[PDB]
Write a structure and sequence with these properties.
- Chain C: It is found in: Periplasm.
- Chain C: One of its GO terms (molecular function) is iron ion binding.
- Chain C: Monomer.
- The structure holds 3 chains of a larger assembly.
- By secondary structure, chain A is mainly beta.
- In chain A, 2% of the residues lie in helices and 49% in strands.
- Chain B is mainly beta and 211 residues long.
- Chain B has 2 domains: 103 residues, Immunoglobulins (Immunoglobulin-like, Sandwich), CATH 2.60.40; 97 residues, Immunoglobulin-like (Sandwich), CATH 2.60.40.10.
- In chain B, strands 2, 4, 5, 6, 9, 10 and 11 form a 7-stranded mixed beta sheet that branches.
- The longest helix of chain B is centred in the middle third of the chain and has 6 residues.
- By secondary structure, chain C is mainly alpha-helical.
- Chain C has one domain: Four Helix Bundle (Hemerythrin (Met), subunit A).
- Chain C contains 5 helices and no strands.
- Chain C is elongated.
- Classes of the chains: A mainly beta (216), B mainly beta (211), C mainly alpha (88).
- At the A-C interface, loops of A face helix 3 of C.
């Protein structure tokens, strides 16, 4: 079975260097050029670089030329993408594509098989969340999670007992570079003053566990 | 070259017909491909050479070309065809540009939003930042312009909006507009309000608190 | 399709930078694939292969080699026109 798997994506300081490798299985790199395409979180696909190991050619996008250096290793059947001088606009999911060789049908196939994709994020620092309650006035209440990095954080109400009507909005990157998301749940106003609603957040990278209680 | 794709967001129910138009900047012969990115997964090829059907996808997808204008047409939608469709040209190895991206959404009857306003908690004011939150639950369509008025003066530049995805049972959105003010600026004024202008509302509704 | 190839083949012999040689070969390749769709088909796999060879040289920044490597394309293209007008 033809498949491609990437590795190496992870937290990197801005201006640092990161190496992505596209381990190819089920075919030979000499018979197919390998391309790298990145997708910024929540945006459209964009092209990065390619290498044609049969001929040794190599090109880069106009916005990336001079920083990335893509190389292939036929013996190990992988293609390495070396990333240097990373900036804040290089956070994305890097997919490893495949593409046939002209002439014939395989050239027309375009990127028929794609990799899983590895997430590369440039980070300044990692800190745990600081959750603030949202006081209720059907009454809606929630816990606002602000200034946490990196993704993700899971919000569970009453240790998972409550799961009806609870929304967890996607994390939005603030100006300072740290995400901040809020979660709300609508409950009947009759039972607002009869039971205690407890919101707990888990942040795996920082091992932060905060248990905040919301009150009217 | 540049590749413009329209519409950027369209709604169609199960069994409806969907047409997505992609227009290249210059002539690209017949080098256009259409991808289908489910949320959070790698794109999958659907049409290649702008008219041929890639083997392994259902036959309902079809492509067309009229000079430099291309089209992806779905004969009959199914609940497995609700994702983002991208238009790619591949004229040369180093001239690949993708389209903006068309998202297909479930269509349902208009539902009015219920708007809440949450004053900042006393715990948050200790740090030095105050963030009021305007909340909208179970509304459709997604477009709902929420404007913040402080002392009846419109506020701009200090509001972040985040919209959840379609629900799995009733297919309704939920928007949350957060207005961020420094503690010094929050104390100067006394009345805050967020207005919601939505189709399901005959007139804009403002929920306000004063403190 | 043949008018695009011949008109842009004068641009390559006139351009003096890698920006205009690469751009001309892009239009020349886009027509070569387009003409192929309409032994004759196997006559274009050689031509498109020679456009790739010239475009690869012009991509590396060697404008002088590309204009020298596009001369060999002129003879191959002229043979197709002579062969096609005989068939029609």
């Amino acid at each position: 079975e033809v498949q491609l798997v990437e590795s190496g994506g992870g937290l990197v300081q801005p201006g640092g260097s990161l190496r992505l490798s596209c381990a190819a299985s089920g075919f030979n790199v000499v018979d197919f050029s390998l391309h790298w395409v990145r997708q910024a979180p929540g945006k459209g696909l964009e092209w990065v670089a390619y290498i044609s190991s049969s001929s040794g050619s190599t090109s880069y996008a106009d916005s990336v030329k001079g920083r990335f250096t893509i190389s292939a290793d036929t013996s190990k059947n992988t293609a390495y993408l070396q990333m240097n001088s990373l900036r804040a606009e290089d956070t994305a999911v890097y997919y490893c594509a495949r593409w046939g060789y002209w002439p014939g049908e395989p050239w027309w196939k375009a990127f028929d098989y794609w990799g899983q994709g590895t997430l590369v994020t440039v980070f300044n620092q990692i800190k745990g969340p600081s959750v603030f309650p949202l006081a209720p006035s059907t009454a809606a209440l929630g816990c606002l999670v602000k200034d946490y990095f990196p993704e993700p954080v899971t919000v569970s109400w009453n240790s998972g007992a409550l799961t009806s009507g609870v929304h967890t909005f996607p994390a939005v990157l603030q100006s300072s570079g740290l995400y901040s998301l809020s979660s709300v749940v609508t409950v009947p106003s009759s039972s607002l003053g009869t039971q205690t609603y407890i919101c707990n957040v888990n942040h795996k990278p920082s091992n932060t566990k905060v248990d905040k209680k919301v009150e009217p | 070259i540049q590749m413009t794709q329209s519409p950027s967001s369209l709604s169609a129910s199960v069994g409806d017909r969907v047409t997505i138009t992609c227009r290249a900047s210059q002539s690209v012969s017949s080098a256009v491909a259409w991808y289908q990115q489910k949320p959070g997964k790698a794109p999958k090829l659907l049409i290649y050479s702008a008219s041929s059907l890639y083997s392994g996808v259902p036959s309902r997808f079809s492509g067309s070309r009229s000079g430099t204008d291309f089209t992806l047409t779905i004969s009959s939608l199914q609940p497995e065809d609700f994702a983002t469709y991208y238009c790619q040209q591949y004229l040369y190895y180093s001239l690949v540009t993708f389209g903006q991206g068309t998202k297909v959404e479930i269509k349902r009857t208009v539902a009015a939003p219920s708007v809440f306003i949450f004053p900042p908690s006393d715990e948050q004011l200790k740090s030095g930042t105050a963030s009021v939150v305007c909340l909208l639950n179970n509304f459709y369509p997604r477009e709902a312009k929420v404007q913040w008025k402080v002392d009846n003066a419109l506020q701009s530049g200090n509001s972040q909006e985040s919209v959840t995805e379609q629900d799995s049972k009733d297919s309704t959105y939920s928007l949350s507009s957060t207005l961020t003010l420094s503690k010094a600026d929050y104390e100067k004024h006394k009345v805050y309000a967020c207005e919601v202008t939505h189709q399901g509302l005959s007139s804009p509704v403002t929920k306000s608190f004063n403190r | 399709a043949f008018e695009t190839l011949n008109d842009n083949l004068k641009v390559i012999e006139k351009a003096d930078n890698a920006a205009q040689v690469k751009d001309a070969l892009t239009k020349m390749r886009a027509a070569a694939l387009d003409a192929q769709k309409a032994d004759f088909r196997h006559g274009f796999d050689i031509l498109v292969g020679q456009i790739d060879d010239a475009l690869k040289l012009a991509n590396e920044g060697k404008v002088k080699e590309a204009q020298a490597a596009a001369e060999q394309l002129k003879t191959t293209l002229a043979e197709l026109q002579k062969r096609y007008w005989a068939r029609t």
